[PDB]
Design a protein around this nucleic acid. Structure first.
Lengths: 52, 117, 19, 8, 134, 52, 51, 73
RNA sequence: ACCAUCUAGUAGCUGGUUCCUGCCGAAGUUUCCCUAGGAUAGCAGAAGCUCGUAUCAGUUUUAU
RNA sequence: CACGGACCAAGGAGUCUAACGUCUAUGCGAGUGUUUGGGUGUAAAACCCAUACGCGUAAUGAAAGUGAACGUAGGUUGGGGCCUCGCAAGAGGUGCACAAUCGACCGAUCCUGAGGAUGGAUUUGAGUAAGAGCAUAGCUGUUGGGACCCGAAAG
């Protein structure tokens, strides 16, 4: 009641809880998603050989 | 607008909090000395002049003599019961007069008066 | 004096530039 | 008696 | 010719990181455009009206297209109806979000849109007027 | 004396800051970095009966 | 869905009754916003001084 | 003092819950609006607007939508 | 003539103006109000739309 | 050429305030600002708030006055992007913001007589053409305050 929820709006006059701009705080899981992985080209070795 | 010595008179309201506390203490003292009665007198409901604000309805100083007479009491006796009485305000709206009369009648019913002795 | 002479020289330079 | 300033 | 955004929001930084990763690992112009728009400042990121979104959806064949907004979606009382379509924005205002929900639409974040469309397929980018403000 | 001592803050911004501070308590990770010996408590957030 | 947190008794024993999360903890965490708000709020209690 | 209210903003004055049910007398004076002006066209739903001044073109849209205007006195 | 305040008076001015490193980096000039006091351009940057393309060059050559 | 420099310790010079403005950051969003005030309190702290008010949400004219959709809010040339074909070039549809041109609508405009009347020549107002604003923090420029510091013949 002091802060409200999705069932009780706010209990206050003209106030609402902040809205998330990103639905998930774990960026690693998004990159590991099957949909993204199926549309991502293979990655290099992370260390370029000291050629010449 | 700095052609004067304004720097000599720069009033800064550092006291806001202390002044509010003092006002609250004064209200508490008045309540202690005016415990049985309300801190503020019963003010009437009035309509505002200055048509820019006529749509707004706001309180007033006190009820007119005609309103007090229609309320079933007298101006002299009304003051002792805390009812604000205005001897210069003339009534010019039947709708406002009826509302004021109803408010006075309700106030008379809600009040309880202890014996004079 | 020192500072006085410097001020006089500066004033003379200003006058020469503007006159 | 009058409406107090601010919510109660 | 931009390195990193000037904002200090952690969530905005994560979104920028994700979009940069997607653009570099997919070379899709949509991801590059979204990343470039992300760096835009608040003044350079005008809000996009819900009425503008409705107008874009009413375009020929745009009903099936999904609307993507880099700015803020603001409600508009000029229209009492809104086409039922998915809407994606960085953050949704209370009025605009309520109108979209009532109209049967959806309000998903940028990360959700990227997950649904890693390559930007079926997406649509709308930006509010710039010269209008001053 | 007329230097700007107090600073005006938006009510909505203050509410957002308070909500964020309250939320940070239940993460159970920021608390350890904050310098609290919450390693031994059973769970976070800690709820105690009303008899307290 | 909201996870429920058990209520601990005064002797450290977990009670059977549990309560759902008030959803306040789901609000976004913005350290920058909190720091900026604190920097201004801390000056509210400041007292004026002058030579 | 002559604040102007756009016909598009007129519908906003009605409560949100009642607006959906309708989709009616509107006291524009209580809303702080003196004159009524038109900028588009409101949905074809009868509307009663209480105002002191109304634009001729705004009255055109009001009549096209089937609404009426009440003049105070 | 002296004592204390307005007065820490009045500037076209003499004197001075405090720790470190990296990068970029000038003009010393045109125009125009008919001027002594600058109004405007250009040299250096800052932000965005486009463009990374065939946009250009203190350079040379050919037809008229 | 000259102004200062016998030496050392301390002190000592772009600091504050009111308004306006660009940029950057946060908050809300056609709304926005709670703190002039009231409630409240662990008492100049912190947390909430009725009603009004500052700004915008629409302008125009020396003035009463008037007040922005014929169109899918307008046709074309384009235009970040999207879709179809194209295993690439490339072809087609869509067209964000945005630049150009020809248009529509609001204040006034000079006449045009259907009694202040219809349209046009067209001018013009940063006007509308689906609003883009309001609150706080920081660097920053101008103005007045002693205003980067000491110092000028004095009433």
């Amino acid at each position: 009641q002091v802060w409200g929820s999705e069932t009780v709006a706010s209990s206050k006059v003209g106030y609402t809880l902040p809205s998330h701009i990103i639905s998930t705080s774990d960026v690693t899981r998004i990159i590991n998603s099957s949909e993204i992985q199926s549309a991502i080209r293979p990655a290099g070795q992370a260390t370029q050989k000291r050629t010449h | 607008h700095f052609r004067k010595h304004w720097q000599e008179r720069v009033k800064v309201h550092f006291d806001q909090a202390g002044k509010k506390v003092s006002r609250r203490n004064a209200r508490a003292t008045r309540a202690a000395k005016i415990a049985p009665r309300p801190l503020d007198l019963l003010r009437p409901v009035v309509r505002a002049p200055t048509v820019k604000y006529n749509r707004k309805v706001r309180a007033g100083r006190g009820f007119t003599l005609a309103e007090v007479k229609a309320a079933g009491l007298t101006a002299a006796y009304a003051r002792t019961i805390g009812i604000a009485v205005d001897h210069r305000r003339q009534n010019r709206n039947q709708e406002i007069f009826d509302a004021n009369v109803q408010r006075l009648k309700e106030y008379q019913s809600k009040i309880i008066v202890f014996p004079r002795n | 004096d020192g500072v006085m002479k410097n001020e006089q020289r500066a004033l003379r330079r200003i006058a020469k530039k503007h006159h | 008696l009058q409406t107090p300033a601010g919510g109660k | 010719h931009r390195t990193a955004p000037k904002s200090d929001n952690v969530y905005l930084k994560l979104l920028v990181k994700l979009y940069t990763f997607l653009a570099r690992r997919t070379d899709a112009p949509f991801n590059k455009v979204v990343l470039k728009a992300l760096f835009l400042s608040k003044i350079n990121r005008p809000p996009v009206s819900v009425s503008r979104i409705a107008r874009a959806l009413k375009q020929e064949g745009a009903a099936n297209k999904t609307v993507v907004v880099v700015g803020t979606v603001t409600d508009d009382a000029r229209i009492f109806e809104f086409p039922k379509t998915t809407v994606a924005a960085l953050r949704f205002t209370a009025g605009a979000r309520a109108k979209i929900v009532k109209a049967g639409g959806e309000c998903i974040t940028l990360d959700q849109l990227a997950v649904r469309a890693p390559k930007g397929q079926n997406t649509l980018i709308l930006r509010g007027p710039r010269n209008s403000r001053e | 004396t007329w230097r700007k001592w107090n600073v005006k803050v938006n009510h909505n911004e203050k509410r957002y800051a308070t909500a964020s501070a309250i939320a940070a308590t239940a993460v159970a990770s920021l608390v350890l970095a904050r310098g609290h010996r919450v390693e031994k408590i059973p769970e976070i957030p800690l709820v105690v009966s009303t008899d307290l | 869905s909201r996870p429920q947190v058990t209520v601990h008794s005064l002797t450290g024993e977990a009670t059977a009754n549990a309560l759902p999360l008030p959803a306040v903890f789901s609000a976004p965490i913005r350290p920058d916003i909190v720091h900026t708000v604190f920097t201004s709020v801390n000056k509210n209690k400041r007292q004026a001084y002058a030579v | 003092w002559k604040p102007v209210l756009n016909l598009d903003k007129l519908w906003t004055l009605i409560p949100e819950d009642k607006r959906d049910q309708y989709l009616p007398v509107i006291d524009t004076l209580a809303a702080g609006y003196g004159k009524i002006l038109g900028k588009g066209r409101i949905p074809n739903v009868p509307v009663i607007v209480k105002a002191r001044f109304v634009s001729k073109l705004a009255e055109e849209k009001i009549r096209a939508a089937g609404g009426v205007v009440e003049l105070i006195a």
